[PDB]
Structure formats: C-alpha cells, structure tokens
From Swiss-Prot:
This is Calponin-1. The lineage of its organism: Eukaryota, Metazoa, Chordata, Craniata, Vertebrata. Smooth muscle, and tissues containing significant amounts of smooth muscle. Thin filament-associated protein that is implicated in the regulation and modulation of smooth muscle contraction. It is capable of binding to actin, calmodulin and tropomyosin. The interaction of calponin with actin inhibits the actomyosin Mg-ATPase activity. Part of cGMP kinase signaling complex at least composed of ACTA2/alpha-actin, CNN1/calponin H1, PLN/phospholamban, PRKG1 and ITPR1. It comes from the Eukaryota. Belongs to the calponin family. The chain holds residues 20 to 142 of 297 of the full protein. Residues 16-119 form the Calponin-homology (CH) domain.
C-alpha cells in the first residue's frame, strides 16, 4: 500500500513501523486505548491478558482490574503463558519484567510480531505487516 520509506533497512532494534501496526491491531481487537506510551499503556498487563483472550476463548481465566502494581504483575503472568499454548514459542516470548520493568521493549514487540501470524492462519483480522516466520 501507499507508503514512502526509501530505506528498506532490516534490523532487530525497535521498529517504529511495526509499533504503529501493533497498537492499531490491539487497540482494536481488545478495545483499550493503549495511548501514546506503547509500553506504559501495555504495562498494566490487562490489555495483554484480554488480547490473547480475544483470539482464544479461555486464554486467561480471570483478569485483575485495579490501580495497583502487584496485581498488574500477576496478569502479565497469565498472558505470557496463555500465548505460549495458543501458538507462540517460549523463545520468542517476553518476560514479566520485560514489560513490567520495561527493561526491554524490543523483546515484547518481537513477541507480538509472531502472535499476529498465529491469528492470521486461524482466520482473524490482523493489520500487521508480518508474513511467514520472519527471523532476521
């Protein structure tokens, strides 16, 4: 589709291109306003639990909704594990601290990049530029 890049640069670092393709997919499926801060907004861990839930009926049994942190952690824990069964290898999944302690952003992004492909085959509406197992 119409899109000027004039770069065609392939890297592993945080891609600002996909960042817009992910938030646009999640913010839609689930229905939560991730907001500017792609991380902080996803830190809560809620949007995550619901994300894998919308794709698989039963992913996350129950989710905690509060303004605390301790609870936010537990949530992310259920998701990361939920996405593991759906169709996401543990070698491409982020850690609870990666999203919680925002110690790693790319690690979390890469995880989603794959998820999108897991929902595509099934028959979902994904707006992420991810074709086949792109590793590199």
């Amino acid at each position: 589709g119409s899109s000027g890049s004039s770069g065609n640069k392939l890297a592993q670092k945080y891609d600002h291109q996909r960042e817009q393709e992910l938030r646009e997919w999640i913010e839609g499926v689930t229905g939560r306003r991730i907001g500017n801060n792609f991380m902080d907004g996803l830190k809560d861990g809620i949007i995550l639990c619901e994300f894998i839930n919308k794709l698989q009926p039963g992913s996350v049994k129950k989710i905690n909704e509060s303004t605390q942190n301790w609870h936010q952690l537990e949530n992310i824990g259920n998701f990361i594990k939920a996405i593991t069964k759906y169709g996401v290898k543990p070698h491409d999944i982020f850690e609870a601290n990666d999203l919680f302690e925002n110690t790693n952003h790319t690690q979390v992004q890469s995880t989603l990049l794959a998820l999108a492909s897991m929902a595509k085959t099934k028959g979902n509406k994904v707006n992420v530029g991810v074709s086949g197992p792109s590793s590199g």
